Structures are given as structure tokens and as C-alpha cells.
Design a protein around this ligand. Structure first.
Ligand SMILES: Cc1ncc(Cn2c(=O)c3cc(S(=O)(=O)NC4(C)CC4)ccc3n(CC3CC3)c2=O)s1
Length: 508
């Protein structure tokens, strides 16, 4: 009973080994760089560029909590500095969870009856042992406040929003990320709270207040994972960089006419994308709002990655909701925790010491792409040509690196994308990803997460199409025939996709 099938994993392209020498890092129209590139050195904390805080309070940039324009009404007409109120509120000793709740609410007065702190109170009072709670309020929380309040000295450059249709990159230091994330913990980002807000209505939540609500047994696990990160980065400043790239394609292939052959496949029911997919493009089965319910209740594939690699969470500050033709590529995030389980069985296990090498820009050699699958009301909706074409184009966009040659592209480490709650058919999604990877000229490493039968079926299908030398176009036309013969006229399907494919090819 083989645990993997196909091309051996050692034969698949990894990184930075099979990842081209980087050009000089520099800001440009499509690339924001928030650190001194001339001073970038291995093992040294990057220096912010510019030296002194420069503020932009407008529609194209993150509205910073430390901004002079971040004001609150006081009474007559006297507008007060919200930043000064944040400083005053957070520079108090917290001995009990109520003190933390009270501090947060001082600069979020409008949410005093709307924000529930039950999970935070229960974590501190009912989950943590006496010594763990003491360490939290005597050392972790004061160290989080200091780095949150250091924000104007750390993030001196305005952060542009990665808005819809923009092809833009942001490179920032892990230290800048820690200061920003300690702010999101203290719920200091302005204009990101109202349910009826229009300005940021198409942006994910960034303030962590939903992580403090309710009684889910999973909240202490999310909190343990995040405090593990905060304890690590406040004790010793991380020295690397992280790049966030929004990619939007205009020109999509005419799939039915794609003459490209299929690429190699490694398929396994054992292993994980983060451990066994090192040096490979790692897929995040994202929500259109990147990170999904990470700052609230979600605990599936995406949320877990965002908890163990917390630097991914800051994409929520500046990443607008993904359109059908967009993806977010994140390079350099570091893994700080290890975990067990998934969803309702998820547990934080221990601290992780990330062994990844850094590239020439001091970024950990870890590339994660966020690609959001569709949510299908009815099962058969996914076989609609427009819905199949959408999934192909989404995966293709996440996998394509325009300009880069095929021999310099690592394999894609992916799995059961859009399954469970979203209603995706694993056999169809596996084919869709195999076709998009072929069009993008990358090999596929596929994880079926315990489903041994799915591993065997994907392998048998792949070997069948490969041996018959069917192109991407040939396979896409078989998907169009399936819809037509079995799904279009279907009122209740009679025949499953893979049997249909074997029959259609073998009888032709
Ligand atoms: C047959 C199925 N298809 C989807 C399913 C959901 N699912 C996953 O998607 C899953 C993803 C990863 S991972 O490699 O993507 N790593 C993460 C979580 C991102 C940090 C790891 C574990 C997963 N487990 C639990 C395990 C099978 C027992 C799971 O149950 S189970």
C-alpha cells in the first residue's frame, strides 16, 4: 500500500537552488520598499526608509493609528489625538483581563457594548496556569505595547493599499510587521471597525477584537499560537524581509486551444504542504478576503497557515478582496509554531525554529500563493464551463510568473482546494490544478490529506492522459463534453467525471 505515487519528490524543482539570482532590490512604481536597501545585511535588523515618520491619510494608503489626522471628537469642537489616547490607555499595568479590555475600549468607545471579550477573559483566567498568566501580563503584554507604540519609528513609509487590478509589490521587514500586528492585537487601526463602513468594506478585518469573543474551545488555541509569535518577536527582533505581491492577469489562455502537454506529478495521502513542500510554491486555499476567519472563528487550511506564519495576517491590512483574475503571492514568511489537528481538533503544540535559508533580499525561502476557490450552492454548478474556466484562470494566475523561464520555476505544492464547506469536487479540482500547472509549465506535488483512494484516482487519471499524450486543450474539451452529456440536461449526475473521461478517450 504505497503512500505516494508518480514522480519521486526528489526529482521535483525546489528553491532557492532552482530559483534564479534576484535583481537588485529597489523601490519603483510597482514596488514599495520600506527599508534601507543599501544597509540590508544578513543577521542585522533592517533600517526603516525614510528615517523620520512620513504620513499619508488618503484613499490609496493604510490609515495609520499614529497619524496626526487620526482624531476623535471631545466635549465642544476640540478634536483630540487618538494616538495620544492609545498611548495613555496602553501604558498601564495590566494585572487582570478586565484591565486589558478597559484599555482597548478607551479608544474604541463606540464598540464598548458591541465587542465581547469572553474568549480573552477565559484564556487569561480559565485556561492559563497562574505562572503562564503572570508571564503574559508581566512580560508578553507590556512588550507587545512597546513595539505597538514604536510604530511611527518603525513604519516610517506610507503603506499603499494593494487595491483591485493593481499589479504591485510591498517589501517590508519582519520587525515592521511585528509592530503592525501588535497594533492589530490592540485594535488601533482606524476606520476598520464599522459593519456599515464603505471606505474599507471590500477589505478584510485587521483589528483582532473578534478573536476575543465567545466561548469556542479553539480560541485559546488561536491565542496560544499568536502569543507564541508575539513572545518570539518582542524578545528578539526578526531580521528578514517579506514581500507581498498582488497579481492580476488580463490575458488568459483559450483553454480549448492549449497545445501544452501535462507536466509531472507527485501525489500522496501523507505529508503537508508546509513541511513536504519546502522550496515549492505553496498553495493557500484562501477566501476572497485573504486569511478568511483567522482574526475571528475560522480554523481550516488558510487560518491555520496564517496562525503558524503570523506575518501572512498583515496582508489583511492592505489587501483588497481578490477578484476572479487575481491572487496574492507572499514570499518570506516565517513559521513560529507547530500544531496538531485541524478545525475542531486544532491545538498549538510548541514553538517552531524555522530552518529555511534566506534569499538575497533576506527573505525566508518560502513562497505562498493565496488562490480562492468558488463556493458552490449546488454540486453540479462547478461543471458549468464558465465556472470551470474561472477555476482554471484563478489557479493559472496563482501559478504563472510572467517573464520567468520554465526551468527556473519550482513545482506547485497543493492539495484538495475548495473542498468541504465550499462544495468542490476533489477529482475535478485536482484536474483543474493539473491543467493550470501545465499551462504555467510547473510540475505538481499533490497532497490528498489521508484520502488514499483520491491519491490512486488522481495518479491513474494523470498517467492515463500522459501516456495518451493528451494536451491541456484535449483535457479541457473532455470537461466541456462531461458538462454537456451529464450535467446540462441533469434535473436530479448518472456517471462520474473520471469514468466518463476513461470511456470518452478509450472509445474514440
Ligand atoms: C480529504 C481531505 N481534503 C481536505 C481536507 C481538509 N484538511 C486539509 O485541508 C489539511 C491541509 C493541511 S496543509 O498541508 O495545507 N497545512 C496547513 C493546515 C496549512 C498549514 C494539513 C492538514 C489538513 N487536514 C488534516 C489532516 C488530514 C489529517 C485536513 O483535514 S481532508
Amino acid at each position: 500500500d504505497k503512500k505516494w505515487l508518480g514522480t519521486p519528490i526528489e526529482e521535483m524543482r525546489r528553491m532557492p537552488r532552482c530559483g534564479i539570482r534576484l535583481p537588485l532590490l529597489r523601490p519603483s512604481a510597482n514596488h514599495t520598499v520600506t527599508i534601507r536597501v543599501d544597509l540590508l545585511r544578513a543577521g542585522e535588523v533592517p533600517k526603516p526608509f525614510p528615517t523620520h515618520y512620513k504620513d499619508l491619510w488618503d484613499n490609496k494608503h493604510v490609515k495609520m493609528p499614529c497619524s496626526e489626522q487620526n482624531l476623535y471628537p471631545v466635549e465642544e469642537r476640540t478634536a483630540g489625538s487618538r494616538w495620544e489616547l492609545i498611548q495613555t490607555a496602553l501604558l498601564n499595568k495590566f494585572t487582570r483581563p478586565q484591565n486589558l479590555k478597559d484599555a482597548i475600549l478607551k479608544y474604541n468607545v463606540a464598540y464598548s457594548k458591541k465587542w465581547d471579550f469572553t474568549a480573552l477573559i477565559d484564556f487569561w483566567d480559565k485556561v492559563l496556569e497562574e505562572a503562564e498568566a503572570q508571564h503574559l501580563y508581566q512580560s508578553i503584554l507590556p512588550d507587545m505595547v512597546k513595539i505597538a507604540l514604536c510604530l511611527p519609528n518603525i513604519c516610517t513609509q506610507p503603506i499603499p493599499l494593494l487595491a483591485a487590478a493593481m499589479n504591485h509589490s510591498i517589501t517590508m521587514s519582519q520587525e515592521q510587521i511585528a509592530s503592525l500586528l501588535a497594533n492589530a492585537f490592540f485594535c488601533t487601526f482606524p476606520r476598520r471597525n464599522a459593519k456599515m463602513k464603505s471606505e474599507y468594506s471590500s477589505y478584510p478585518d485587521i483589528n483582532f477584537n473578534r478573536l476575543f469573543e465567545g466561548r469556542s474551545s479553539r480560541k485559546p488555541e488561536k491565542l496560544k499560537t499568536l502569543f507564541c509569535y508575539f513572545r518570539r518577536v518582542t524578545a528578539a527582533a526578526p531580521t528578514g524581509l517579506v514581500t507581498f505581491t498582488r497579481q492580476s492577469l488580463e490575458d488568459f489562455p483559450e483553454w480549448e486551444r492549449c497545445e501544452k502537454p501535462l507536466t509531472r506529478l507527485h501525489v500522496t495521502y501523507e505529508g503537508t504542504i508546509e513541511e513536504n513542500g519546502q522550496g515549492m510554491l505553496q498553495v493557500d486555499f484562501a477566501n476572497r478576503f485573504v486569511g478568511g476567519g483567522v482574526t475571528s472563528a475560522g480554523l481550516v487550511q488558510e487560518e491555520i497557515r496564517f496562525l503558524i506564519n503570523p506575518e501572512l495576517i498583515i496582508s489583511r491590512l492592505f489587501t483588497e478582496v481578490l477578484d476572479h483574475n487575481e491572487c496574492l503571492i507572499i514570499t518570506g514568511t516565517e513559521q513560529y509554531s507547530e500544531y496538531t489537528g485541524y478545525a475542531e481538533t486544532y491545538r498549538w503544540s510548541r514553538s517552531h525554529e524555522d530552518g529555511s535559508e534566506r534569499d538575497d533580499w533576506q527573505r525566508r525561502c518560502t513562497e505562498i500563493v493565496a488562490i480562492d476557490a468558488l463556493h458552490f450552492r449546488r454540486y453540479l454548478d462547478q461543471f458549468v464551463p464558465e465556472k470551470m474556466r474561472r477555476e482554471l484562470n484563478k489557479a493559472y494566475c496563482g501559478f504563472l510568473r510572467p517573464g520567468v523561464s520554465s526551468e527556473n520555476l519550482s513545482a506547485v505544492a497543493t492539495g484538495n482546494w475548495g473542498c468541504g464547506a465550499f462544495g468542490g469536487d476533489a477529482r475535478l479540482k485536482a484536474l483543474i490544478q493539473i491543467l493550470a500547472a501545465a499551462a504555467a509549465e510547473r510540475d505538481v506535488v499533490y497532497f490528498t490529506f489521508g484520502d488514499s483512494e483520491l491519491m490512486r484516482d488522481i495518479y491513474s487519471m494523470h498517467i492515463f492522459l500522459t501516456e495518451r499524450k493528451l494536451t491541456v486543450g484535449d483535457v479541457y474539451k473532455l470537461l466541456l463534453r462531461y458538462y454537456n452529456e451529464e450535467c446540462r440536461n441533469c434535473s436530479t449526475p448518472d456517471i462520474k467525471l473520471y469514468p466518463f473521461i476513461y470511456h470518452a478517450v478509450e472509445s474514440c
